[PDB]
């Protein structure tokens, strides 16, 4: 690998130089003969595996606070090494945990929102022992992050993995999501994405209202025990009914969505340590709701219904009736959130901010890993600046990772 | 290993074995992906490449290891020995050109790959000859609006000092002019090429949509200017089926997209002039040509006529105007009976093509970054389709612009 890799923006002709890729730690899935850039996803660490991973991270941390090679750095190194040697693992200091979480976000190549990476409230939940305790921590997170509509990014970090048989897990994919119900006739009520999880909740004892927008209960696993069900207090769940500034009929569609996107099924990796329960939240880019949640054929799938209300010619694809309806739905989502003073960002503003962030990162850090396939929004790609921006994708640690769904691996007691 | 690609909407899983055939580099490594980067002979080099190609050709016609196949290899080897190169048979040229298209990972139009009219222009020696061949291509491909895919192939590279080149990036394009007030008139993408034409004696009309002359280089000589006969240049005035004011924008485009600056590589041989043409997908014109900030950049004017509120981005005024412009382009071509395909129909055909290719070929190299359309991405099926990208030969390649190489 050459020391300097250059990226060009084809619209501005700006050329940036990447050196940070030299710090890449993991595989992308690509090789010199194949690219897997559009592939969605292309037992514990031993003492000897853990040693260099910890040192790599501790070095990175002390370099970041301008104390590299200091007495405190050398002492922390020795202390960590001693701990790994005597206990097969180690515990992060609060400072290091905070640094690690912010950097996992900073390193998330798929995230367009990273200009915000240094403003992340970190909740240390490593003292948690029970599902009830996890419930308490999660409620506090939701309330803090929601902030009456003035959303604040946050992460709550539960105890790290030990032997792999005592994992903390949030079984939910996001803290707040809507149930989906498969009907005897093959139709689906609610969110089809969530049918499997909904069925699991029902089996565990959840009594479902069986509506279109039912907030799912939390299914929480502490210390490897069987997961337990909890209802999020509804006053903590901020929702926005969707209406359109021109179309008075849009409200009659009965759509709404929740304000807080809070992904809860990822794994946070810091210094070789694995935090299998680390729910984090930011705020929405409008297209996540207006394009994907509402218009994906396998999701709420509303294009036809909206197009019919718009009196559109739906006989030919070339009338672009779908595209026309898609825009109006996204206008409505943004309009409804702004009207209710719930933080949201449009895809133009978000990508423009991301470009500035990327330029700053190249300047101060020597690069910014970015996954074009994910960064470019799902509508109007080329009229956003990110479409024209060459990117380099690579994996830096600390990082957020995918992990298997817990019902697939859980040993029921 | 066999690699699986999944469609996340349909849950269809395909199995790729074809990638195992590639030997050319992608640009990525195990540690860095360059998937969004635009651009990541000798006798000794020549024979194995030739052999590789002759082998797959005789395999494709189910006569691998035949007397014909063996005689051909023997023939090619002697020819490389005694002349430092070799000449393709007509059958081989056609097979190779079709497969370069078939292997073009960035092309969403590949369901048409085996329907390609190949014009053999390897006997051409002068720019005048090049002009004749190109006029014939344009006339055949245009076909009064019923567009037909075609490629015209000029003599291959010999020593690199006698290249045939079409200096135009496409056979038909619009001039761009830098103005005193620092603005650009016409297509800003073509400002440089336009200046070269002017320098060489082209008298510019200095309008918004002036069809550029052809600038043609034969056998490494200085390029020469030619005017395409205007009756051969099919154009479409853009109007809108609802907005009667849209025609007042004075917009038009040409019907024939004919890319002329790529290099066609077959069996180690390099065809530096190989203009090829198909037909448009509407977004090429309506989104990129018309709405790129660096191109005609019409969103603001259009949004004005639509009386949209343009104070805040979150009104999505850009997205609204964008859809209407793309409706106009499709409507206009269709009303004039000029072949064009919308991004919905095109991507749908591409998914079917992928399925065909996995079934009969073991895979289909595809570049998601290029395949997904520049508007309404996730409401087309390719957005949800995992793709594998790898490099197969015969292929179309980029080459440097001739004005950065040519000594006059
Ligand atoms: C502050 C506002 C934020 C915005 C506007 C934002 C925006 C986005 C968007 C639009 C995506 C693509 C999601 C999809 O299409 O499914 C994404 C992905 C991602 N975000 Fe951000 N994000 C924000 C905050 C955060 C925070 C606070 C974290 C972690 C601390 C984070 C970590 C990630 C990760 C790891 C991904 C990749 C997800 C995956 O691969 O499934 N983001 N972000
Ligand atoms: C017949 C109808 C066709 C359609 C609708 C079509 C569609 C497209 C589109 C939309 C692109 C993206 C181009 C861009 O965004 O600049 C593309 C790329 C490409 N097409 Fe096709 N195409 C067609 C025929 C052909 C033919 C006949 C050939 C060659 C014989 C071809 C070879 C290529 C190549 C090499 C690329 C990649 C261009 C690059 O890398 O710059 N296509 N196609
Ligand atoms: C996991 C999966 C598999 C197949 N299809 C779709 C998915 C969903 C992708 C999950 N990632 C969603 C995600 C993650 C982090 C986010 C952070 C902020 C934000 N606004 N949205 C996010 C959205
Ligand atoms: C030339 C260039 C330089 C820098 N960045 C970007 C580019 C754009 C690449 C141009 N490719 C255009 C192209 C190629 C083949 C096509 C075939 C059919 C068709 N309808 N359009 C095509 C359009
Ligand atoms: C096949 C493809 O990789 C897949 O559909 C991806 C494309 N890009 C994406 N980009 C974002 N932001 N979110 C997604 O879910 C996806 N899905
Ligand atoms: C940076 C990025 O690679 C570049 O803008 C690409 C993105 N995808 C594209 N896709 C198509 N079809 N055509 C293009 O010119 C581009 N440009
Ligand atoms: Zn790659």
PDB file of N, CA, C and O in Angstrom, chain A residues 5-8 10 16 35 362 372 389-393, chain B residues 26-28 32-40 106 367 369-370 389 398:
ATOM      1  N   UNK A   5      -2.965   8.133  -0.905  1.00  0.00           N
ATOM      2  CA  UNK A   5      -4.042   7.845  -1.843  1.00  0.00           C
ATOM      3  C   UNK A   5      -4.863   9.119  -2.027  1.00  0.00           C
ATOM      4  O   UNK A   5      -5.224   9.763  -1.044  1.00  0.00           O
ATOM      5  N   UNK A   6      -5.147   9.496  -3.273  1.00  0.00           N
ATOM      6  CA  UNK A   6      -5.883  10.735  -3.539  1.00  0.00           C
ATOM      7  C   UNK A   6      -7.341  10.489  -3.929  1.00  0.00           C
ATOM      8  O   UNK A   6      -7.637   9.536  -4.650  1.00  0.00           O
ATOM      9  N   UNK A   7      -8.246  11.328  -3.421  1.00  0.00           N
ATOM     10  CA  UNK A   7      -9.642  11.311  -3.869  1.00  0.00           C
ATOM     11  C   UNK A   7     -10.001  12.639  -4.516  1.00  0.00           C
ATOM     12  O   UNK A   7      -9.507  13.691  -4.110  1.00  0.00           O
ATOM     13  N   UNK A   8     -10.856  12.580  -5.531  1.00  0.00           N
ATOM     14  CA  UNK A   8     -11.252  13.766  -6.267  1.00  0.00           C
ATOM     15  C   UNK A   8     -12.752  13.975  -6.129  1.00  0.00           C
ATOM     16  O   UNK A   8     -13.517  13.010  -6.050  1.00  0.00           O
ATOM     17  N   UNK A  10     -15.659  15.341  -8.392  1.00  0.00           N
ATOM     18  CA  UNK A  10     -15.762  15.585  -9.835  1.00  0.00           C
ATOM     19  C   UNK A  10     -16.548  16.829 -10.192  1.00  0.00           C
ATOM     20  O   UNK A  10     -16.537  17.282 -11.336  1.00  0.00           O
ATOM     21  N   UNK A  16      -8.269  15.596  -2.465  1.00  0.00           N
ATOM     22  CA  UNK A  16      -7.841  15.375  -1.083  1.00  0.00           C
ATOM     23  C   UNK A  16      -6.857  14.210  -1.029  1.00  0.00           C
ATOM     24  O   UNK A  16      -6.904  13.314  -1.878  1.00  0.00           O
ATOM     25  N   UNK A  35     -14.519  -6.547  -5.974  1.00  0.00           N
ATOM     26  CA  UNK A  35     -14.997  -5.549  -5.029  1.00  0.00           C
ATOM     27  C   UNK A  35     -16.360  -5.946  -4.476  1.00  0.00           C
ATOM     28  O   UNK A  35     -17.255  -6.329  -5.224  1.00  0.00           O
ATOM     29  N   UNK A 362      -9.824  15.084   6.596  1.00  0.00           N
ATOM     30  CA  UNK A 362      -8.657  14.897   5.754  1.00  0.00           C
ATOM     31  C   UNK A 362      -7.561  15.845   6.216  1.00  0.00           C
ATOM     32  O   UNK A 362      -6.389  15.477   6.310  1.00  0.00           O
ATOM     33  N   UNK A 372     -19.572   5.072   0.047  1.00  0.00           N
ATOM     34  CA  UNK A 372     -20.381   5.855  -0.889  1.00  0.00           C
ATOM     35  C   UNK A 372     -21.786   5.251  -1.021  1.00  0.00           C
ATOM     36  O   UNK A 372     -22.800   5.963  -1.042  1.00  0.00           O
ATOM     37  N   UNK A 389     -18.440  12.932  -4.967  1.00  0.00           N
ATOM     38  CA  UNK A 389     -17.239  12.853  -4.150  1.00  0.00           C
ATOM     39  C   UNK A 389     -16.655  11.442  -4.140  1.00  0.00           C
ATOM     40  O   UNK A 389     -17.291  10.515  -3.629  1.00  0.00           O
ATOM     41  N   UNK A 390     -15.445  11.271  -4.668  1.00  0.00           N
ATOM     42  CA  UNK A 390     -14.759   9.990  -4.513  1.00  0.00           C
ATOM     43  C   UNK A 390     -14.487   9.734  -3.031  1.00  0.00           C
ATOM     44  O   UNK A 390     -14.128  10.650  -2.293  1.00  0.00           O
ATOM     45  N   UNK A 391     -14.669   8.494  -2.599  1.00  0.00           N
ATOM     46  CA  UNK A 391     -14.426   8.139  -1.210  1.00  0.00           C
ATOM     47  C   UNK A 391     -13.520   6.921  -1.124  1.00  0.00           C
ATOM     48  O   UNK A 391     -13.407   6.142  -2.074  1.00  0.00           O
ATOM     49  N   UNK A 392     -12.851   6.786   0.012  1.00  0.00           N
ATOM     50  CA  UNK A 392     -12.069   5.594   0.307  1.00  0.00           C
ATOM     51  C   UNK A 392     -12.733   4.922   1.495  1.00  0.00           C
ATOM     52  O   UNK A 392     -13.060   5.581   2.478  1.00  0.00           O
ATOM     53  N   UNK A 393     -12.969   3.620   1.399  1.00  0.00           N
ATOM     54  CA  UNK A 393     -13.563   2.907   2.525  1.00  0.00           C
ATOM     55  C   UNK A 393     -12.570   1.937   3.146  1.00  0.00           C
ATOM     56  O   UNK A 393     -11.926   1.157   2.443  1.00  0.00           O
TER      57      UNK A 393
ATOM     58  N   UNK B  26      -8.992  -4.793  -9.639  1.00  0.00           N
ATOM     59  CA  UNK B  26     -10.133  -3.900  -9.422  1.00  0.00           C
ATOM     60  C   UNK B  26      -9.703  -2.524  -8.933  1.00  0.00           C
ATOM     61  O   UNK B  26     -10.325  -1.515  -9.261  1.00  0.00           O
ATOM     62  N   UNK B  27      -8.660  -2.495  -8.119  1.00  0.00           N
ATOM     63  CA  UNK B  27      -8.238  -1.264  -7.476  1.00  0.00           C
ATOM     64  C   UNK B  27      -8.356  -1.357  -5.968  1.00  0.00           C
ATOM     65  O   UNK B  27      -7.672  -0.640  -5.233  1.00  0.00           O
ATOM     66  N   UNK B  28      -9.221  -2.251  -5.499  1.00  0.00           N
ATOM     67  CA  UNK B  28      -9.401  -2.451  -4.066  1.00  0.00           C
ATOM     68  C   UNK B  28      -8.326  -3.387  -3.553  1.00  0.00           C
ATOM     69  O   UNK B  28      -7.665  -4.065  -4.330  1.00  0.00           O
ATOM     70  N   UNK B  32      -8.535  -1.754   1.772  1.00  0.00           N
ATOM     71  CA  UNK B  32      -9.172  -0.533   1.280  1.00  0.00           C
ATOM     72  C   UNK B  32     -10.046  -0.800   0.059  1.00  0.00           C
ATOM     73  O   UNK B  32      -9.612  -1.467  -0.885  1.00  0.00           O
ATOM     74  N   UNK B  33     -11.284  -0.300   0.087  1.00  0.00           N
ATOM     75  CA  UNK B  33     -12.185  -0.405  -1.053  1.00  0.00           C
ATOM     76  C   UNK B  33     -12.178   0.914  -1.817  1.00  0.00           C
ATOM     77  O   UNK B  33     -12.302   1.991  -1.221  1.00  0.00           O
ATOM     78  N   UNK B  34     -12.004   0.817  -3.132  1.00  0.00           N
ATOM     79  CA  UNK B  34     -12.002   1.988  -4.009  1.00  0.00           C
ATOM     80  C   UNK B  34     -13.186   1.974  -4.951  1.00  0.00           C
ATOM     81  O   UNK B  34     -13.112   2.487  -6.077  1.00  0.00           O
ATOM     82  N   UNK B  35     -14.283   1.385  -4.478  1.00  0.00           N
ATOM     83  CA  UNK B  35     -15.476   1.209  -5.288  1.00  0.00           C
ATOM     84  C   UNK B  35     -16.073   2.496  -5.839  1.00  0.00           C
ATOM     85  O   UNK B  35     -16.785   2.462  -6.841  1.00  0.00           O
ATOM     86  N   UNK B  36     -15.793   3.634  -5.200  1.00  0.00           N
ATOM     87  CA  UNK B  36     -16.348   4.901  -5.692  1.00  0.00           C
ATOM     88  C   UNK B  36     -15.316   5.765  -6.419  1.00  0.00           C
ATOM     89  O   UNK B  36     -15.598   6.914  -6.754  1.00  0.00           O
ATOM     90  N   UNK B  37     -14.124   5.217  -6.639  1.00  0.00           N
ATOM     91  CA  UNK B  37     -13.099   5.925  -7.402  1.00  0.00           C
ATOM     92  C   UNK B  37     -13.396   5.779  -8.890  1.00  0.00           C
ATOM     93  O   UNK B  37     -13.684   4.679  -9.372  1.00  0.00           O
ATOM     94  N   UNK B  38     -13.347   6.886  -9.621  1.00  0.00           N
ATOM     95  CA  UNK B  38     -13.649   6.871 -11.056  1.00  0.00           C
ATOM     96  C   UNK B  38     -12.648   6.013 -11.848  1.00  0.00           C
ATOM     97  O   UNK B  38     -13.042   5.129 -12.622  1.00  0.00           O
ATOM     98  N   UNK B  39     -11.358   6.280 -11.642  1.00  0.00           N
ATOM     99  CA  UNK B  39     -10.282   5.518 -12.279  1.00  0.00           C
ATOM    100  C   UNK B  39      -9.257   5.052 -11.250  1.00  0.00           C
ATOM    101  O   UNK B  39      -8.311   5.782 -10.967  1.00  0.00           O
ATOM    102  N   UNK B  40      -9.421   3.840 -10.691  1.00  0.00           N
ATOM    103  CA  UNK B  40      -8.413   3.411  -9.715  1.00  0.00           C
ATOM    104  C   UNK B  40      -7.084   3.088 -10.399  1.00  0.00           C
ATOM    105  O   UNK B  40      -6.377   2.155 -10.017  1.00  0.00           O
ATOM    106  N   UNK B 106     -20.362  -1.267 -15.439  1.00  0.00           N
ATOM    107  CA  UNK B 106     -21.076  -0.020 -15.180  1.00  0.00           C
ATOM    108  C   UNK B 106     -22.325   0.203 -16.027  1.00  0.00           C
ATOM    109  O   UNK B 106     -23.029   1.190 -15.839  1.00  0.00           O
ATOM    110  N   UNK B 367     -21.341  -2.833 -11.193  1.00  0.00           N
ATOM    111  CA  UNK B 367     -20.865  -1.726 -10.370  1.00  0.00           C
ATOM    112  C   UNK B 367     -22.055  -0.944  -9.815  1.00  0.00           C
ATOM    113  O   UNK B 367     -22.637  -0.103 -10.503  1.00  0.00           O
ATOM    114  N   UNK B 369     -22.455   1.415  -7.781  1.00  0.00           N
ATOM    115  CA  UNK B 369     -22.279   2.863  -7.761  1.00  0.00           C
ATOM    116  C   UNK B 369     -22.745   3.470  -9.084  1.00  0.00           C
ATOM    117  O   UNK B 369     -23.342   4.539  -9.104  1.00  0.00           O
ATOM    118  N   UNK B 370     -22.523   2.753 -10.185  1.00  0.00           N
ATOM    119  CA  UNK B 370     -22.933   3.235 -11.500  1.00  0.00           C
ATOM    120  C   UNK B 370     -24.309   2.753 -11.943  1.00  0.00           C
ATOM    121  O   UNK B 370     -25.011   3.455 -12.669  1.00  0.00           O
ATOM    122  N   UNK B 389     -18.393  -6.815  -8.194  1.00  0.00           N
ATOM    123  CA  UNK B 389     -17.707  -6.171  -9.310  1.00  0.00           C
ATOM    124  C   UNK B 389     -16.315  -6.763  -9.514  1.00  0.00           C
ATOM    125  O   UNK B 389     -15.523  -6.887  -8.573  1.00  0.00           O
ATOM    126  N   UNK B 398     -10.871   3.263 -20.150  1.00  0.00           N
ATOM    127  CA  UNK B 398     -10.625   4.683 -20.331  1.00  0.00           C
ATOM    128  C   UNK B 398      -9.230   4.870 -20.896  1.00  0.00           C
ATOM    129  O   UNK B 398      -8.359   4.019 -20.717  1.00  0.00           O
TER     130      UNK B 398
END
